[PDB]
Design an enzyme around this catalytic site. Sequence first.
Site, PDB file in Angstrom:
ATOM      1  CG  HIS B 200      -2.024   1.167   1.415  1.00  0.00           C
ATOM      2  ND1 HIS B 200      -2.438   1.891   0.245  1.00  0.00           N
ATOM      3  CD2 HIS B 200      -2.240   1.920   2.357  1.00  0.00           C
ATOM      4  CE1 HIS B 200      -3.094   2.975   0.588  1.00  0.00           C
ATOM      5  NE2 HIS B 200      -3.070   2.990   1.654  1.00  0.00           N
ATOM      6  CB  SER B 204      -0.627  -0.925  -8.300  1.00  0.00           C
ATOM      7  OG  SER B 204      -1.549  -0.932  -7.139  1.00  0.00           O
ATOM      8  CG  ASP B 227     -10.388  -6.671  -8.914  1.00  0.00           C
ATOM      9  OD1 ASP B 227      -9.958  -6.720 -10.124  1.00  0.00           O
ATOM     10  OD2 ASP B 227      -9.612  -6.681  -7.955  1.00  0.00           O
ATOM     11  CD  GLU B 270      -2.759 -33.263  -5.167  1.00  0.00           C
ATOM     12  OE1 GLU B 270      -1.418 -33.513  -4.884  1.00  0.00           O
ATOM     13  OE2 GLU B 270      -3.427 -33.243  -4.292  1.00  0.00           O
TER      14      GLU B 270
HETATM   15  C1  HEM Z   1      -1.090 -16.317  -1.326  1.00  0.00           C
HETATM   16  C2  HEM Z   1      -1.678 -15.753  -2.256  1.00  0.00           C
HETATM   17  C3  HEM Z   1      -1.368 -14.222  -2.756  1.00  0.00           C
HETATM   18  C4  HEM Z   1      -2.081 -13.291  -2.529  1.00  0.00           C
HETATM   19  C5  HEM Z   1      -3.783 -13.317  -1.951  1.00  0.00           C
HETATM   20  C6  HEM Z   1      -1.799 -12.152  -3.185  1.00  0.00           C
HETATM   21  C7  HEM Z   1      -2.496 -10.782  -3.160  1.00  0.00           C
HETATM   22  C8  HEM Z   1      -2.026  -9.772  -3.841  1.00  0.00           C
HETATM   23  C9  HEM Z   1      -2.645  -8.742  -4.162  1.00  0.00           C
HETATM   24  C10 HEM Z   1      -4.155  -8.456  -3.630  1.00  0.00           C
HETATM   25  C11 HEM Z   1      -2.006  -7.807  -4.684  1.00  0.00           C
HETATM   26  C12 HEM Z   1      -2.185  -6.448  -5.393  1.00  0.00           C
HETATM   27  C13 HEM Z   1      -2.788  -6.456  -6.890  1.00  0.00           C
HETATM   28  C14 HEM Z   1      -2.052  -6.953  -7.782  1.00  0.00           C
HETATM   29  O1  HEM Z   1      -1.209  -6.450  -8.278  1.00  0.00           O
HETATM   30  O2  HEM Z   1      -2.334  -8.301  -8.162  1.00  0.00           O
HETATM   31  C15 HEM Z   1      -0.738  -8.448  -4.910  1.00  0.00           C
HETATM   32  C16 HEM Z   1       0.419  -8.015  -5.841  1.00  0.00           C
HETATM   33  C17 HEM Z   1       1.535  -8.401  -5.639  1.00  0.00           C
HETATM   34  N1  HEM Z   1       2.086  -9.819  -5.108  1.00  0.00           N
HETATM   35 FE1  HEM Z   1       0.614 -10.969  -4.305  1.00  0.00          FE
HETATM   36  N2  HEM Z   1      -0.347 -12.471  -3.440  1.00  0.00           N
HETATM   37  C18 HEM Z   1       0.078 -13.599  -3.257  1.00  0.00           C
HETATM   38  C19 HEM Z   1       0.827 -14.335  -3.520  1.00  0.00           C
HETATM   39  C20 HEM Z   1       2.041 -13.846  -3.978  1.00  0.00           C
HETATM   40  C21 HEM Z   1       3.342 -14.346  -4.158  1.00  0.00           C
HETATM   41  C22 HEM Z   1       3.553 -15.756  -3.833  1.00  0.00           C
HETATM   42  C23 HEM Z   1       4.108 -13.329  -4.719  1.00  0.00           C
HETATM   43  C24 HEM Z   1       5.700 -13.443  -4.783  1.00  0.00           C
HETATM   44  C25 HEM Z   1       5.995 -14.137  -5.949  1.00  0.00           C
HETATM   45  C26 HEM Z   1       3.507 -12.092  -4.556  1.00  0.00           C
HETATM   46  C27 HEM Z   1       4.068 -10.781  -4.923  1.00  0.00           C
HETATM   47  C28 HEM Z   1       3.432  -9.555  -5.247  1.00  0.00           C
HETATM   48  C29 HEM Z   1       3.803  -8.550  -5.921  1.00  0.00           C
HETATM   49  C30 HEM Z   1       5.332  -8.472  -6.398  1.00  0.00           C
HETATM   50  C31 HEM Z   1       2.833  -7.649  -6.151  1.00  0.00           C
HETATM   51  C32 HEM Z   1       2.887  -6.653  -6.910  1.00  0.00           C
HETATM   52  C33 HEM Z   1       2.351  -6.533  -8.438  1.00  0.00           C
HETATM   53  C34 HEM Z   1       1.909  -5.257  -8.552  1.00  0.00           C
HETATM   54  O3  HEM Z   1       1.156  -4.629  -7.725  1.00  0.00           O
HETATM   55  O4  HEM Z   1       1.807  -4.776  -9.739  1.00  0.00           O
HETATM   56  N3  HEM Z   1       2.285 -12.497  -4.271  1.00  0.00           N
HETATM   57  N4  HEM Z   1      -0.777  -9.786  -4.382  1.00  0.00           N
HETATM   58  C1  HEM Z   2      -8.161 -24.012   7.324  1.00  0.00           C
HETATM   59  C2  HEM Z   2      -9.187 -24.249   6.313  1.00  0.00           C
HETATM   60  C3  HEM Z   2      -8.923 -25.790   5.787  1.00  0.00           C
HETATM   61  C4  HEM Z   2      -9.452 -27.052   6.390  1.00  0.00           C
HETATM   62  C5  HEM Z   2     -10.022 -26.948   7.622  1.00  0.00           C
HETATM   63  C6  HEM Z   2      -9.151 -27.975   5.558  1.00  0.00           C
HETATM   64  C7  HEM Z   2      -9.467 -29.308   5.497  1.00  0.00           C
HETATM   65  C8  HEM Z   2      -9.463 -30.306   4.767  1.00  0.00           C
HETATM   66  C9  HEM Z   2      -9.800 -31.715   4.838  1.00  0.00           C
HETATM   67  C10 HEM Z   2     -10.407 -31.997   6.272  1.00  0.00           C
HETATM   68  C11 HEM Z   2      -9.409 -32.312   3.872  1.00  0.00           C
HETATM   69  C12 HEM Z   2      -9.592 -33.850   3.577  1.00  0.00           C
HETATM   70  C13 HEM Z   2     -11.200 -33.986   2.803  1.00  0.00           C
HETATM   71  C14 HEM Z   2     -10.858 -33.721   1.269  1.00  0.00           C
HETATM   72  O1  HEM Z   2     -10.118 -34.248   0.951  1.00  0.00           O
HETATM   73  O2  HEM Z   2     -11.875 -33.185   0.610  1.00  0.00           O
HETATM   74  C15 HEM Z   2      -8.827 -31.348   2.990  1.00  0.00           C
HETATM   75  C16 HEM Z   2      -8.124 -31.799   1.727  1.00  0.00           C
HETATM   76  C17 HEM Z   2      -7.278 -31.029   0.990  1.00  0.00           C
HETATM   77  N1  HEM Z   2      -7.294 -29.506   1.188  1.00  0.00           N
HETATM   78 FE1  HEM Z   2      -7.811 -28.598   2.884  1.00  0.00          FE
HETATM   79  N2  HEM Z   2      -8.566 -27.472   4.541  1.00  0.00           N
HETATM   80  C18 HEM Z   2      -8.373 -25.936   4.477  1.00  0.00           C
HETATM   81  C19 HEM Z   2      -7.612 -25.172   3.642  1.00  0.00           C
HETATM   82  C20 HEM Z   2      -6.916 -25.560   2.420  1.00  0.00           C
HETATM   83  C21 HEM Z   2      -6.308 -24.856   1.705  1.00  0.00           C
HETATM   84  C22 HEM Z   2      -6.053 -23.314   1.923  1.00  0.00           C
HETATM   85  C23 HEM Z   2      -5.804 -25.411   0.796  1.00  0.00           C
HETATM   86  C24 HEM Z   2      -4.962 -24.996  -0.341  1.00  0.00           C
HETATM   87  C25 HEM Z   2      -3.571 -24.800  -0.135  1.00  0.00           C
HETATM   88  C26 HEM Z   2      -6.280 -26.851   1.062  1.00  0.00           C
HETATM   89  C27 HEM Z   2      -5.952 -27.673   0.209  1.00  0.00           C
HETATM   90  C28 HEM Z   2      -6.471 -29.162   0.185  1.00  0.00           C
HETATM   91  C29 HEM Z   2      -6.118 -30.190  -0.692  1.00  0.00           C
HETATM   92  C30 HEM Z   2      -5.100 -30.100  -1.738  1.00  0.00           C
HETATM   93  C31 HEM Z   2      -6.901 -31.334  -0.164  1.00  0.00           C
HETATM   94  C32 HEM Z   2      -6.736 -32.715  -0.780  1.00  0.00           C
HETATM   95  C33 HEM Z   2      -8.064 -32.596  -1.709  1.00  0.00           C
HETATM   96  C34 HEM Z   2      -8.065 -34.186  -2.435  1.00  0.00           C
HETATM   97  O3  HEM Z   2      -8.000 -35.462  -1.888  1.00  0.00           O
HETATM   98  O4  HEM Z   2      -8.647 -34.138  -3.700  1.00  0.00           O
HETATM   99  N3  HEM Z   2      -6.989 -26.930   2.078  1.00  0.00           N
HETATM  100  N4  HEM Z   2      -8.791 -30.143   3.697  1.00  0.00           N
END
Ligand code: HEM
Ligand code: HEM
Lengths: 89, 380, 111, 48, 101, 31
Positions: B200, B204, B227, B270
């Site tokens: 912020h 951007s 969005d 996966e």
């Molecule tokens: C966990 C999932 C993520 C969320 C929810 C997230 C969320 C956001 C949001 C809301 C923005 C501002 C809007 C935009 O520019 O697209 C942003 C920008 C950015 N994010 Fe993330 N982000 C995530 C993952 C990452 C990761 C893994 C990286 C590192 C590679 C990253 C690096 C950046 C950078 C460098 C910007 C600035 C780009 C720009 O404003 O032009 N983000 N992200």
């Molecule tokens: C805190 C919130 C979350 C809870 C309580 C939760 C709980 C669970 C549970 C109980 C399962 C096994 C049941 C199933 O396979 O459908 C599962 C599967 C899975 N979750 Fe989550 N989860 C959460 C958030 C997430 C998030 C953020 C991700 C992504 C990074 C994720 C990725 C997965 C994946 C890849 C599987 C395997 C699905 C499959 O077998 O095809 N989960 N989760």
Amino acid sequence: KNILRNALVSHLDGTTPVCEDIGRSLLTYGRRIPLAEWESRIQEVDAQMLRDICSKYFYDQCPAVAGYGPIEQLPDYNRIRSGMFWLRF
Amino acid sequence: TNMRKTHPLFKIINHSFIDLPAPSNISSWWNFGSLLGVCLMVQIITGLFLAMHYTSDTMTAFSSVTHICRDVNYGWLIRYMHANGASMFFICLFLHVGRGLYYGSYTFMETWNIGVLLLFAVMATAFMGYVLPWGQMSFWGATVITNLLSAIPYIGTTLVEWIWGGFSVDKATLTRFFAFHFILPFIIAALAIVHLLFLHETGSNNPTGLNSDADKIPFHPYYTIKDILGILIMFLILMTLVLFFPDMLGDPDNYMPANPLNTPPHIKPEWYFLFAYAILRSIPNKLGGVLALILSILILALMPFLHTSKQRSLMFRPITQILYWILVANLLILTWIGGQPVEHPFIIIGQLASISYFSIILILMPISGIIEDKMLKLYP
Amino acid sequence: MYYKFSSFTQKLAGAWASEAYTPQGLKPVSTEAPPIIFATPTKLTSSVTAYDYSGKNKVPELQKFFQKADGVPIHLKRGLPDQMLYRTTMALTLGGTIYCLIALYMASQPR
Amino acid sequence: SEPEHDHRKRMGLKMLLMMGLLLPLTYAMKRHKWSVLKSRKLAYRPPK
Amino acid sequence: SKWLDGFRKWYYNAAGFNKLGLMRDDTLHETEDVKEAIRRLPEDLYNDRMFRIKRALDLTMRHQILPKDQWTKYEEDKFYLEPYLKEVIRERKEREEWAKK
Amino acid sequence: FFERAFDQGADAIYEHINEGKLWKHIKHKYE
Ligand code: HEM
Ligand code: HEM
């Protein structure tokens, strides 16, 4: 209404504004509207026809905006157009 | 007098979401991170439903997964949104990081560091949540990763003792997996809040890489409705994946119950881990393999120190554009090799592709950058 | 020195000696000032129809309509609807052509 | 393996019709709120 | 030097920033040294630079380019920010030499 | 005033495209 009465009468002081009113009244209205007719037209103006006329001319219209100077905080046309109406009247 | 600038909640909302100046030329790629945010929300919603009818008791855990698919109304639907939303989460995450590598967004150093911390956290949550439904594939991947973690000297022993919790498969392992998979997405949301807060104060980035203070517009209503359109398109694609082809991305072998005595003929996670598994199929060393995976992810964090060019974006850099597109090409080569058996000639393709990936990240972009620097008369 | 045309209501208000009767400045020449324009570059053109509703012939007033110097070709001269069905015609024939090439390439391969 | 097939395809075409109804509405709204911007012409008048 | 001249002309044409009406020095990443060299510019070159940047921004908003007649040609590309930039690196390197000693 | 008509229209075109295999088409046979 009182401010407009003072505005219409106070301007016609002397000869030059009276002559100018005569000239542009004969050029635009086709006649010189007397001040008694101006008061008569002012007299029936009340609140509901004023808000009807203002809703006819101000509400939900696309305005024209002109700006000059540091106008970097002047809003976009979307904000002004959205401010031209209200959500729930 | 107006409530948008004297009320503190509305002042926060106006300052962070409405009157925030944004560049007027950002493409649809800038929607993607916002999509990632609401993607998080979707999983949390399904996570709440997976807190309802899931038990951490191995055979009845698989039975509870089948009961969620059958007995609970719209429970199969929630399970399929959870799986396909993890897939869509990694699609949007990969395209977000690709935007960051392409348009020179890595110059924001602390936002990049918060991002790579988020990326480690979300890979950990995805693998750990893959362990929870307790199939044969989840079992064998869990055993492979835990033995690889136990291969390190005198550190992995207490981690296996805390994680497995006993001599063999017991309920404590699945309870601690479910606890960590519950807890760490909320830490991901907290680091997303920190991610936005660090974004912020600097504004951007535009795709041209120039200073965009000359032409800036309010976020509302342009990028709000943009969005919204992106959210509707992402919902359309996710529900097309859920309601029409529910298992085209999922591994079919996960759906039969786990048996430790049998060995499956092709271990496979996966797709979004597969390229990392390609690195695990690259070099024949355990701790060298862990160092290879960790450095292959951490090289994104080391990437902002390798920027040798005097211009930010790749839009005006054709040679580095070619290098970036062959980087995407051989990353796709790694994620195809990772879903292949270890036979000729996949081993040489995987090894040369991993070597080419490390070279195309690390050593060759500085040379391309100084070539770009020299071809425009700025290099000594 | 007595009245000057001003006040945004088109009125002869009161001004000074150097304000009303000397609207020009006391500058020597036009200096190196920032330049001026009052001209919107939108190039907007409005064409009115102004037709007759009677006479039951209707050909000479379409003759007036089609003899215009707008530079538009005669298949976009009606305005909205000709443009609409021209756009839909070209869109459906492009879709038909690409689906024809897809069908021909699919028929080229055997089963 | 799939006792869910008919209801899944029911929600499938319901989703398809709803998405095809509600996507051009947001598309036209975005095109309106950006066609206020895309009609902007800029001019530079330096004092020379 | 006909090998280098034609390749430089082709690389200038294929770089793409001449199609949006930019000079070379507008494309540079604005670090603190580049911002200091921008701060030392005269007012007319500064106003030209910000107008060219704004024109680039709302040209790539529409995903369009300039017409071919008014692209930035290679011979009229002026390195206006280059001597100020060289002066800024000279002072910064002198300051780091004095801090080292 | 729109969504229930939308739901029944989607359902009706679903039995129109899928005829002779759903369970609702053989209500006359057993009940
Ligand atoms: C966990 C999932 C993520 C969320 C929810 C997230 C969320 C956001 C949001 C809301 C923005 C501002 C809007 C935009 O520019 O697209 C942003 C920008 C950015 N994010 Fe993330 N982000 C995530 C993952 C990452 C990761 C893994 C990286 C590192 C590679 C990253 C690096 C950046 C950078 C460098 C910007 C600035 C780009 C720009 O404003 O032009 N983000 N992200
Ligand atoms: C805190 C919130 C979350 C809870 C309580 C939760 C709980 C669970 C549970 C109980 C399962 C096994 C049941 C199933 O396979 O459908 C599962 C599967 C899975 N979750 Fe989550 N989860 C959460 C958030 C997430 C998030 C953020 C991700 C992504 C990074 C994720 C990725 C997965 C994946 C890849 C599987 C395997 C699905 C499959 O077998 O095809 N989960 N989760």
